[PDB]
Amino acid sequence: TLLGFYKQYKALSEYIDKKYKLSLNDLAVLDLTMKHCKDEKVLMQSFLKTAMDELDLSRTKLLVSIRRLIEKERLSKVRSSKDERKIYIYLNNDDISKFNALFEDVEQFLNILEHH
Amino acid sequence: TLLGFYKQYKALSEYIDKKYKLSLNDLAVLDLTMKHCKDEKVLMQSFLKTAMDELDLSRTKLLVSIRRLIEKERLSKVRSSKDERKIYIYLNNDDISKFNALFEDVEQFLNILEHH
């Protein structure tokens, strides 16, 4: 069951990587943004604080994930308007359908792995 | 369930890393040395062949796990005296003792994690 768990993680991790060019860190971050950012803009700084705390990653590794997500069009960003130093992240409606598709696919691959 | 699994994996990895200075890849390989070089010295080029076959890891990956397991004195190697200067890997009785103590401890921690 240790070895079992190792096979699950490797298979799962290869699947996500070959299919969506994301890591599990990426999916952990994306899932956070769903809870804290559903069609409501959130300041990076505030999100990074919640995120570092909840997922025990470095600030540095989170920004890698956040950049990758926005680069791959799974998460949105906005600057300004008033203050050109406050950046905001958010999930729009297409980001959300994408989120629903990625996780149904990924969670269902995990259900299968959890048997064989 | 996705984030659950991620949490489990993060915690197990960190436990193995902090307490044993090993990775999951290592444990997997060690488990594999236990199904193959418990009773015989085994030729390393022969181990890897059946290792990649059964674990699907990078040859490049395996050679670093093996070497770490020997450096950590959880696996043993010897150099043919006879005609080749080829390398054999094997588990001795101290190694097998360390193997059972290691897997007992890690399986028990995994068991704890799989309840929360």
DSSP A45-91: HHHHHHHHHHH---HHHHHHHHHHHHHTTSSEEE--SS-TT--EEEB
Q: Look at phi and psi of residue A93 and say left if phi exceeds 0, alpha if psi is from -120 to 50, else beta.
A: alpha
On whether the CB atoms of residues B78 and B41 are closer than 8 A, the answer is yes
What is the resolution of the experimental data for this entry, in Å? Answer: 2.5
As beta bridge partners, residue A88 has A43, A78
**Nearest-angstrom CA–CA distance, B79 and A48:** 52
Question: How big, in percent rounded to 5, are the helix, strand and coil portions of chain A?
Answer: 70, 10, 25
Determine the residue among A1, A3, A110 to mutate to test chain B binding: the one whose Cβ has the most chain B Cβ atoms within 10 Å.
Answer: A3
Angle, vertex CA B60, rays to CA B57 and CA B61, nearest 5: 45
Half-sphere exposure of B62 (CA within 13 A, CB side): 20
Q: Which chain B residue lies closest to A106 (C-alpha atoms)?
A: B2
Tell me how far apart the alpha carbons of residues B71 and B22 are, in angstroms, rounded to a whole number: 11
- Separation in Å, CA A86 to CA A61, A100, B7: 20, 28, 31
Which DSSP helix (H) or strand (E) runs through B92?
none
Which of B2, B9, B110 is opposite residue A1, by nearest beta carbon?
B110
The coordinates were experimentally obtained by X-ray
3-state SS assignment for residue A101: helix
**Is residue B110 within 8 Å of residue A5, measured between CB atoms?**
yes
